[PDB]
Scaffold this active site. Structure first.
Site, PDB file in Angstrom:
ATOM      1  N   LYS A 164      27.811 -58.493  29.845  1.00  0.00           N
ATOM      2  CA  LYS A 164      28.665 -58.763  28.693  1.00  0.00           C
ATOM      3  C   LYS A 164      29.303 -57.488  28.148  1.00  0.00           C
ATOM      4  CE  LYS A 164      25.126 -60.902  26.611  1.00  0.00           C
ATOM      5  NZ  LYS A 164      25.200 -59.791  25.639  1.00  0.00           N
ATOM      6  N   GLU A 190      23.199 -53.975  18.762  1.00  0.00           N
ATOM      7  CA  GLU A 190      23.285 -53.307  20.051  1.00  0.00           C
ATOM      8  C   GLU A 190      22.322 -52.128  20.119  1.00  0.00           C
ATOM      9  OE1 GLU A 190      27.034 -51.871  21.291  1.00  0.00           O
ATOM     10  OE2 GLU A 190      27.469 -53.612  22.565  1.00  0.00           O
ATOM     11  N   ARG A 191      22.045 -51.698  21.348  1.00  0.00           N
ATOM     12  CA  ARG A 191      21.338 -50.445  21.549  1.00  0.00           C
ATOM     13  C   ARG A 191      22.195 -49.302  21.028  1.00  0.00           C
ATOM     14  NH1 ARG A 191      21.930 -53.218  26.307  1.00  0.00           N
ATOM     15  NH2 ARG A 191      20.101 -54.447  26.918  1.00  0.00           N
TER      16      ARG A 191
HETATM   17  N1  LIG Z   1      31.271 -54.434  37.418  1.00  0.00           N
HETATM   18  C1  LIG Z   1      30.003 -54.242  37.794  1.00  0.00           C
HETATM   19  N2  LIG Z   1      29.760 -53.875  39.071  1.00  0.00           N
HETATM   20  C2  LIG Z   1      28.496 -53.681  39.455  1.00  0.00           C
HETATM   21  N3  LIG Z   1      27.377 -53.799  38.738  1.00  0.00           N
HETATM   22  C3  LIG Z   1      27.646 -54.162  37.480  1.00  0.00           C
HETATM   23  C4  LIG Z   1      28.898 -54.398  36.935  1.00  0.00           C
HETATM   24  N4  LIG Z   1      28.794 -54.755  35.600  1.00  0.00           N
HETATM   25  C5  LIG Z   1      27.503 -54.728  35.374  1.00  0.00           C
HETATM   26  N5  LIG Z   1      26.750 -54.377  36.463  1.00  0.00           N
HETATM   27  C6  LIG Z   1      25.297 -54.253  36.536  1.00  0.00           C
HETATM   28  O1  LIG Z   1      24.723 -55.143  35.606  1.00  0.00           O
HETATM   29  C7  LIG Z   1      24.265 -54.423  34.440  1.00  0.00           C
HETATM   30  C8  LIG Z   1      24.903 -55.025  33.209  1.00  0.00           C
HETATM   31  O2  LIG Z   1      24.454 -54.323  32.032  1.00  0.00           O
HETATM   32  P1  LIG Z   1      25.002 -54.709  30.600  1.00  0.00           P
HETATM   33  O3  LIG Z   1      24.354 -53.838  29.528  1.00  0.00           O
HETATM   34  O4  LIG Z   1      26.479 -54.710  30.643  1.00  0.00           O
HETATM   35  O5  LIG Z   1      24.450 -56.176  30.391  1.00  0.00           O
HETATM   36  P2  LIG Z   1      24.074 -57.110  29.161  1.00  0.00           P
HETATM   37  O6  LIG Z   1      22.668 -57.545  29.163  1.00  0.00           O
HETATM   38  O7  LIG Z   1      25.069 -58.257  29.163  1.00  0.00           O
HETATM   39  O8  LIG Z   1      24.405 -56.183  27.919  1.00  0.00           O
HETATM   40  P3  LIG Z   1      23.974 -56.003  26.377  1.00  0.00           P
HETATM   41  O9  LIG Z   1      22.663 -56.795  26.241  1.00  0.00           O
HETATM   42  O10 LIG Z   1      23.859 -54.549  26.049  1.00  0.00           O
HETATM   43  O11 LIG Z   1      25.067 -56.708  25.588  1.00  0.00           O
HETATM   44  C9  LIG Z   1      24.595 -52.951  34.679  1.00  0.00           C
HETATM   45  O12 LIG Z   1      23.525 -52.131  34.226  1.00  0.00           O
HETATM   46  C10 LIG Z   1      24.760 -52.866  36.198  1.00  0.00           C
HETATM   47  O13 LIG Z   1      23.530 -52.634  36.867  1.00  0.00           O
HETATM   48 MG   LIG Z   2      25.678 -53.765  26.088  1.00  0.00          MG
END
Ligand SMILES: Nc1ncnc2c1ncn2[C@@H]1O[C@H](COP(=O)(O)OP(=O)(O)OP(=O)(O)O)[C@@H](O)[C@H]1O
Ligand SMILES: [Mg+2]
Ligand SMILES: Nc1ncnc2c1ncn2[C@@H]1O[C@H](COP(=O)(O)OP(=O)(O)OP(=O)(O)O)[C@@H](O)[C@H]1O
Ligand SMILES: Nc1ncnc2c1ncn2[C@@H]1O[C@H](COP(=O)(O)OP(=O)(O)OP(=O)(O)O)[C@@H](O)[C@H]1O
Ligand SMILES: [Mg+2]
Ligand SMILES: [Mg+2]
Lengths: 471, 476, 470
Positions: A164, A190-191
């Site tokens: 996200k 957020e973190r």
């Molecule tokens: N475009 C991408 N290509 C490859 N790997 C990706 C991509 N986007 C995300 N990832 C992987 O997935 C993870 C997504 O982390 P992110 O913090 O964006 O997720 P989240 O749980 O939705 O976020 P938050 O809880 O902080 O809102 C990254 O750490 C990476 O390992």
């Molecule tokens: Mg995030």
């Protein structure tokens, strides 16, 4: 006496007593400042929001600053108004907290600047205006199957660890640094690591000159975490109304708004509801999101992230907020476990814009057909497992053959993913996307191996990739 | 006396001390100009639900009683205007110019004051008119997952009912006013605002006004039903009224029930929906028909509120998501969709043309499942599957293109009698429109007989015309 | 003697009798007020006592809507429970919960005999039992779970499954045959179906053999509670004092318990189970025990029961399950499949499936049918995982004949002429047994499975197969 004493303290909640005839209103802001006369006593820097008038001169309040160190008999001060966040052009390029004070260590906003309340009623029926116009961000899946709407709400739905915030940052890059327009960013729940990384990435990209930021963070007491988004909204409102300037409003993981409301209600003494949620879930949510609308005077576009508490999408908070949105992208996990980024559900994602006469006849004609072929793939998997070759036959076999090719093509290399592989991202325009999917459907490229179609931007690159790999 | 002092204020509830002669259900007024309803009376303190923004109310404020029960202004001036659940204009444009006020605590039409529903109602949608007919005075439910076609079907129905005089009401409950604006603009664009009233309840407005909205809508409609008009009332989301009452109950500290809803959920919706009826000839003959909606999470028919409202209505139209994304629109599941007033609401020609279609379509669905598990089937089963596949195409329809009742029976008769045998499934939709045009320009007299008679014509000329058209029609 | 109202919270009111006399439980109180000024509303109300409070105070459930009530109103004590007009006068007429008639056809004078609604149940010595079959003409009930004369019959289902279609079909055939006094009480029904049934009865002329009490959805909980007891009270006189055999019909009994649960929290009762009142089983057994056949007279009671979320394991259906002698459970899957009615063949039971009641051949046919259906019920899960080409000859034959059977359990109905436009049929038990014996032995394997759908008699099956062109 205008001042009032403190009778009770219990966690964030404080119960103040005012003399009869001088009670504040429901959403007033109150202040506490204490002179310490004993070594035991501590300094206090506290402001509070009224919640309920619980009778017999007593008023129940909510903490915006931590209540540790409070004593009975202290004197509360009534401001006679809400927080009154200072607003104007002075707040461009600055980082604030929920109370309207900066944290960027640059300076203090002057005492004569105009300041406006956080709480005010939404735009009326007569003042709204409606039109559907595409906002082009260059992400293949979201610009083919669910294009955004200028002046409308956009929602990123997902669980933990899906992407996200990666999507948020990629949208900030692609849209804001190639289209222009005033932006406001509210980091919610957020973190606090990412509250620094965004600041430095925007400064080294050189875009802070036209944006404002407010952060509340997990650490803060529950009331601040919920009021932060309303502070961001009251900031953007001055742009859209009094300056007449359009706003792009980013909010991250809005679920923490409902979660903090739940905790605060649990403290307040309201009866439980749903899964531990407050009774006033959709009232308190609707009061917020009804203000983010495009009046004729000016418009607010908002891109928001919704965190799903668990595997259950039917949790009250994700469900209730779904009624307020205009375009939604739902983030899959099984695609993420297959590495097909961005893991966006091509069948659950929706938008008000996808109509044969709102986004173009050709675009819609190809989009709905591709969605139909995806739904055909989804149901037809079982026959492959149960019997394989001699039941997956003829038209179903051809459907599978092309569907496997087109499944990977929704994946794209990202600008903010440069950390994970050594190559930059690409912004793919709409016409190229629409033509590229069509060229796949023709069978023009179905002789290429399926794995090639991952993480590329244009259909010619797939021929280049197949030649480079020699497969 | 008739006044009292407020002693507690919060979240829209306000206990007061005084108000000695207050009656249950009586409206009260605060110095803020905000109205309130005295729901509960304890020994020494009234319990007042606030009907406006509570931000302005303080402890020690005086409250006065109006002397009347909860009343909604009604009249003919409300047509084409947008209003609150209360009689306050929302579109500006001066006052609402209403005639009189109907107390909304009135009783339903009693036993033997009604009549069998026989007056037809045409939605303009082939699938609904053919498989799940609706009659006037009926209360039918449209239910499904979000983003499937609820408001598309309600608006198509309201727009198609342009000629036959029908005071229509559209209640928006807990809505986003951008959607209210879009709906109003579509009604104005297609020329239907001149006979509709819109009552608005939106999330910015306090929680009690969402609970009062469908009551005010039906109270407005029943004035025209008592005077003798045909009326229609639409509730696009009753689920949000349930949530509003759940909020209101918990703030009064009342124990929950299954899920989290209180026990009064059945009573509230039954008290609401029982006021729809087809009055008897001794009463005047009015016919108010209600079309409520509920949204079910994950498309689940088996839940507390869904089955609660399903037990109170005379029919089900089920909107299913995977049919929607498969391209079958409007997506209606034959199996779970049926009407309990069917047979009377259809004109006799439609009944003679297709009366077994729904059962045969559910049989086609279950046979498709059996074929999904198995490998292959015998010849007659192949023929049955082939025909059941065609039945789905003949019920496909594109948005905002209404059809009159007479045109449907031609294609449905062609389908049921086996005239679509030589036409591949791909060409059925083209066949339909070409058949429409051919009958419009060549076979007008059959349609004339159908229109005047309200019954099927002598089938000899119909069969000859269909054979001639099959001669004209070219196959891909 | 008079008492003052002091509290009102929706259905419940709190009268205070400070005269030095108090009413007993279940008594009825009266409110009749004339508006003194333009603000006041004239009100006519009756209240039944439900609980005694401490200081000259009782908790009273209101029989009608409580709007306009003012604290300080004066309440009359009638000194007796709710009185119902009992006699031959009830035949034809329709009444409300308080005993007044609903149709405009007339009034009932003061001289008529009136009885209280609350009284103890019959004792152990008075009951009697028998095994005689009550033929229905419905293939499923007749062949797999026969009803019995004088036995309690239960129809269980959720919303929209086919309960009231069965009620109407049974009432049509039984009222065509039986020379019985009939009482029809509708609890928590649709007020439209009451008028529709009234007109159908007037077409049939049965209205002179019937007495009706009506309270439906639009009524406060108290009437929904007491309506079934009023109908039962009338059936009581007809069973005992006249000594005439009677039929009692109640549709969706559940709302009797639901109305009690709704006001239960207002009565100070701690919650229990899934929101239900603590006193659920006491009240349900109290109602159900009074509906019994004695030596003086016999009551054939046919009942329909609603499940709040269609979960048969729900408390209310579970408590009722113990009081029945024959049960048909209708569940949505058969309705989805198109086979009607939706009775589950493998969960509907009666006390009459025994060779000493129905004979050897009937019992063997029924049990063999159930065995075949259970074998296919497990084979569905097996076939889903493995496919349909891995089974052996006998396993394939099981599927073939189960498919042929559950269609034949579907029948063209009489009252379903409106819904499907078909004539209808009455199938004798012997013909059902003959046809099912023909089916189980494989005498009709060649016919396609569509030929077996929604037909009365196997001869109609052969006719439909002839129509298909096989
Ligand atoms: N475009 C991408 N290509 C490859 N790997 C990706 C991509 N986007 C995300 N990832 C992987 O997935 C993870 C997504 O982390 P992110 O913090 O964006 O997720 P989240 O749980 O939705 O976020 P938050 O809880 O902080 O809102 C990254 O750490 C990476 O390992
Ligand atoms: Mg995030
Ligand atoms: N005949 C039709 N052909 C094609 N699409 C149709 C047809 N009828 C309806 N639709 C589609 O169905 C959808 C209807 O959406 P609408 O806003 O009316 O839904 P709703 O369920 O009332 O609202 P929400 O999803 O906001 O709760 C639109 O996407 C519309 O294009
Ligand atoms: N034998 C039948 N043949 C065809 N259709 C039938 C048959 N029985 C029922 N139906 C259909 O199913 C519907 C079931 O309605 P019914 O009044 O029987 O519901 P119910 O089970 O009593 O439910 P509720 O408890 O909600 O009142 C009928 O209106 C009709 O459309
Ligand atoms: Mg909608
Ligand atoms: Mg019923």
């Amino acid at each position: 006496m205008t001042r009032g004493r403190v009778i009770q303290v219990m966690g964030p909640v404080v119960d103040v007593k005012f003399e009869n005839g001088h009670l504040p209103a429901i959403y007033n802001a109150l202040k506490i400042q204490h002179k310490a006369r004993n070594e035991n006593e501590v300094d206090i820097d506290l402001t509070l929001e009224v919640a309920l008038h619980l009778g017999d001169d007593t008023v129940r309040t909510i903490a915006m600053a931590s209540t540790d160190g409070l004593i009975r008999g202290m004197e509360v001060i009534d401001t006679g108004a809400p927080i009154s966040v200072p607003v104007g052009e002075v707040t461009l390029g600055r980082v604030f907290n929920v109370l309207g004070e900066p944290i960027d260590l640059e300076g203090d906003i002057p005492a004569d600047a105009r300041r406006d309340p956080i709480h005010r009623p939404a735009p009326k029926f007569e003042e709204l205006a409606t039109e559907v116009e595409i906002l082009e961000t260059g992400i293949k899946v979201v610009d083919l199957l669910a294009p955004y709407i200028k002046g409308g709400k956009i929602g990123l739905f997902g669980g933990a660890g899906v992407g996200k915030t990666v999507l948020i940052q990629e949208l900030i890059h692609n849209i804001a640094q190639e289209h222009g327009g005033i932006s406001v960013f509210a980091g919610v729940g957020e973190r606090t690591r990412e509250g620094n990384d965004l600041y430095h990435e925007m400064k080294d990209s050189g875009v802070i000159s036209k944006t404002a930021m407010v952060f509340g963070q997990m650490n803060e007491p529950p009331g601040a975490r919920m009021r932060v988004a309303l502070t961001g909204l009251t900031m953007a409102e001055y742009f859209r109304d009094e300056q007449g300037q359009d706003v792009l409003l980013f909010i991250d993981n809005i679920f923490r708004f409902t979660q903090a409301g739940s905790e605060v209600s649990a403290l307040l003494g309201r009866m439980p509801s749903a899964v531990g949620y407050q009774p006033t879930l959709a009232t308190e949510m609707g009061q917020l999101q009804e203000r983010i609308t495009s009046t004729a005077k000016g418009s607010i576009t908002s891109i928001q992230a919704i965190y799903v508490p668990a595997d259950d999408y039917t949790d009250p908070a994700p469900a209730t907020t779904f009624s307020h949105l205009d375009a939604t992208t739902n983030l899959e996990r099984k695609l993420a476990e297959m590495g097909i980024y961005p893991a966006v559900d091509p069948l659950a994602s929706t938008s008000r814009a996808l109509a044969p006469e709102i986004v173009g006849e050709e675009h819609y004609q190809v989009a709905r057909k591709v969605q139909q072929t995806l739904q055909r793939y989804k149901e037809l998997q079982d026959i492959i497992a149960i019997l394989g070759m001699d039941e997956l036959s003829d038209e179903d076999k051809l459907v599978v053959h092309r569907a496997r090719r087109i499944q990977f093509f929704l994946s794209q290399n990202f600008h903010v993913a440069e950390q994970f592989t050594g190559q930059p991202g690409s912004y793919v325009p709409v016409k190229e996307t629409v033509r590229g999917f069509k060229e796949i459907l023709e069978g023009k490229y179905d002789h290429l191996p399926e794995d090639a179609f991952r993480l590329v931007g244009r259909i010619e690159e797939v021929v280049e990739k197949a030649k480079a790999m020699g497969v | 006396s008739d006044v009292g002092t407020v002693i507690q204020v919060g979240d829209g509830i306000a206990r007061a001390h005084g108000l000695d002669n207050v009656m249950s259900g009586e409206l009260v007024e605060f110095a803020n100009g905000v109205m309130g309803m005295a729901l509960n009376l304890e020994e020494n303190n009234v319990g007042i639900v606030i009907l406006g923004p509570y931000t302005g109310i303080k402890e020690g404020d005086e409250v006065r009683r109006t002397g009347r029960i909860m009343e909604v202004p009604v009249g003919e001036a409300l047509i084409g205007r947008v209003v609150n659940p209360l009689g306050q204009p929302v579109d500006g444009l001066g006052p609402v110019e209403t005639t009189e006020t109907r107390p909304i605590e009135s009783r339903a039409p009693g036993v033997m004051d009604r009549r069998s529903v026989h007056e037809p109602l045409q939605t303009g949608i082939k699938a609904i008119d053919a498989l799940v007919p609706i009659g006037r005075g009926q209360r039918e439910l449209i239910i499904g997952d979000r983003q499937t076609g609820k408001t598309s079907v309600a608006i198509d129905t309201i727009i198609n009912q342009k000629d036959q005089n029908m005071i229509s009401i559209y209640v928006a409950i807990g809505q986003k006013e951008s959607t209210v604006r879009t709906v109003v603009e579509t009604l104005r664009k297609h020329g239907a605002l001149d006979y509709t009233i819109v009552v608005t309840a939106s999330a910015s407005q306090p929680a009690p006004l969402l609970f009062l909205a469908p009551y005010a809508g039906v109270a407005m409609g029943e004035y025209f039903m008592y005077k003798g008009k045909h009326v229609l009332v639409v509730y696009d989301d009753l689920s949000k009224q349930a949530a509003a009452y759940r909020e209101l109950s918990l703030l009064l500290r009342r124990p929950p029930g299954r899920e989290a809803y209180p026990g009064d959920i059945f009573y509230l919706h039954s008290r609401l929906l029982e006021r729809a009826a087809k009055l008897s000839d001794a009463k005047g003959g009015g016919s108010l028909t209600a079309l409520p909606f509920v949204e079910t999470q994950a498309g689940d028919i088996s839940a507390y509120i869904p089955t609660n409202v399903i037990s109170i209505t005379d029919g089900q139209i089920f909107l299913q998501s995977d049919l929607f994304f498969s391209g079958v629109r409007p997506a209606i599941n034959a199996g779970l969709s049926v009407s309990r007033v069917g047979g009377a609401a259809q004109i006799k020609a439609m009944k003679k043309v297709a009366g077994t279609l729904r059962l045969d379509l559910a049989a086609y669905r279950e046979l498709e499942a059996f074929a999904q598990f198995g490998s292959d089937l015998d010849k007659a089963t192949q023929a049955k599957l082939a025909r059941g596949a065609r039945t789905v195409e003949v019920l496909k329809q594109d948005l905002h293109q209404p059809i009159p009742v007479e045109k449907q029976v031609l294609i449905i008769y062609a389908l049921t009698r086996g005239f679509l045998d030589d036409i591949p499934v791909e060409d059925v939709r083209r066949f339909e429109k070409e058949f429409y045009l051919f009958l419009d320009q060549n076979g007008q007299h059959l349609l004339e007989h159908i229109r005047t008679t309200k019954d099927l014509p002598n089938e000899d000329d119909l069969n000859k015309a269909i054979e001639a058209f099959k001669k004209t029609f070219v196959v891909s």
